Ligand binder design. Structure first.
Ligand code: S2E
Ligand code: S2E
Lengths: 236, 5, 236, 5
């Protein structure tokens, strides 16, 4: 690790600076360095890690989708052969995306998840594990595609089981987990009915618990509830 | 695309 | 060069794909590879090169400005010492920016400018040379700052002299050169009056030549004329 | 910031 010589606190400080500068690759590298110091992450630090890699892989995914679209058009009946370049470059971006996902999964496996005992940390990390296997699934086409999908499903399921036992239904981590697991069902697992059921039940159970919340907690929970509603509107 | 967080 | 084994035509194709995917670092690397094949660049290829590096350095400049702002605030009377991290990270981004500028300047010097004989290519490249010395000037503070500024000025001046002899006043390259040289005067050379004079005279001479143009050429020229007007509105 | 192209 090229961050091995930098103080943990300096890495966290520089991650925050990189965020302000919208330098998310740097932010991710700084947070990888911080994780590799071996200490557990605080709540703020976990979110710095997740924000950084979500932004990096989100850009990769958007680029991959553009290139995959161009590639599929080049392969339609009536297209002029353009040679191997579109496939090659899509593969290049794909390999870089897979590398980022493997990096994040590696950090979770060495050793964030195994040291995470509190529900807020353990559910957060298992959600991330589901998310990054989901991104691998989005580009997977080989002998391993089913296993990648099942790895995402298993991580999301363990996170769901913990969240239902240990968190209130309005907990934003619980809500965001359900939001994303619902998208996994719809987009990855060819299970739109499960996706819709999960989003609706999550929304309704949250609604019934909003009365317990402060104004600031209410704002956080209703924000994610609106994303659940948005997806349900897209799907029905 | 659907919303995720 | 890691692009040494790829066909020139494949590099150009992949630059266009990278553009569509908004992968401007890749686009710049592909176009650097294409330049290093040693052949002159067509009009389209010159603009692919310029678009790529302008986008890359533009992001670096925006990040540097954010970090420099944070750094100046940390140094105001009343601030809590945060340690060396803000300066270090600003320096990191600065060094990366300088590296991109040196790369572009290196391509122009080896050997794009010396082989560029037509006004449309030679003015284009000399404008780029002024632009990338201007970006170096924006971050320069040492023994070389004056020399960097004079290198930008000299490149812009040679481009201006050629453009006034060889291009009509509505030529979009001539207009964009004047736009940027005017910004150099205002922001780098502490010469706002020269900046304003150059923008106004460029605008007025273009206006008087619009009658010679087709509808499509008119659209191209008036677009840049509007940028000149925008800057004049900012400055007066 | 002023416009450049
Ligand atoms: N960026 C930063 N420097 C920091 C972010 C945070 C932080 C801490 C807790 C929660 C969040 N919450 C979010 O970021 C959003 O909600 C989430 C909900 C569930 C999950 Cl699992 C993840 C995010 C993102 C979507 O829109 C609403 C806010 C941030 C601390 S520092
Ligand atoms: N991107 C691409 N794949 C391509 C871009 C071009 C191309 C060719 C000629 C001119 C331009 N013109 C521009 O890009 C803009 O005008 C310029 C004017 C002067 C100068 Cl010196 C540079 C740009 C940028 C600012 O807004 C209006 C258009 C593009 C071919 S392929």
């Amino acid at each position: 690790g090229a961050m091995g010589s930098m103080e943990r606190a300096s890495l966290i400080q520089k991650a925050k600076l990189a965020e302000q500068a919208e330098r998310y690759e740097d932010m991710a590298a700084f947070m990888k360095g911080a994780v590799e110091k071996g200490e557990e992450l605080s709540c703020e630090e976990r979110n710095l890690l997740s924000v950084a890699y979500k932004n990096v892989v989100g850009g990769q995914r958007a680029a991959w989708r553009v290139l995959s679209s161009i590639e599929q058009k080049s392969n339609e009946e009536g297209s002029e052969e353009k040679g191997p370049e579109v496939r090659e470059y899509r593969e290049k971006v794909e390999t870089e995306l897979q590398g980022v996902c493997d990096t994040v999964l590696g950090l979770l496996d060495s050793h964030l998840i195994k040291e995470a005992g509190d529900a807020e940390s353990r559910v957060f990390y298992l959600k991330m594990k589901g998310d990054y296997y989901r991104y691998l699934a989005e580009v997977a086409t080989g002998d391993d595609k089913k296993r990648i999908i099942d790895s995402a499903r298993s991580a999301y399921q363990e996170a769901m089981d913990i969240s239902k036992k240990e968190m209130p239904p309005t907990n934003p981590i619980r809500l965001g987990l359900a939001l994303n697991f619902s998208v996994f069902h719809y987009e990855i697992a060819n299970s739109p009915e499960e996706a819709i059921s999960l989003a609706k039940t999550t929304f309704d159970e949250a609604m019934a618990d909003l009365h317990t919340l402060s104004e600031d907690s209410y704002k956080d929970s209703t924000l994610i509830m609106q994303l659940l509603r948005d997806n349900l509107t897209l799907w029905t | 695309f659907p919303a995720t967080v």
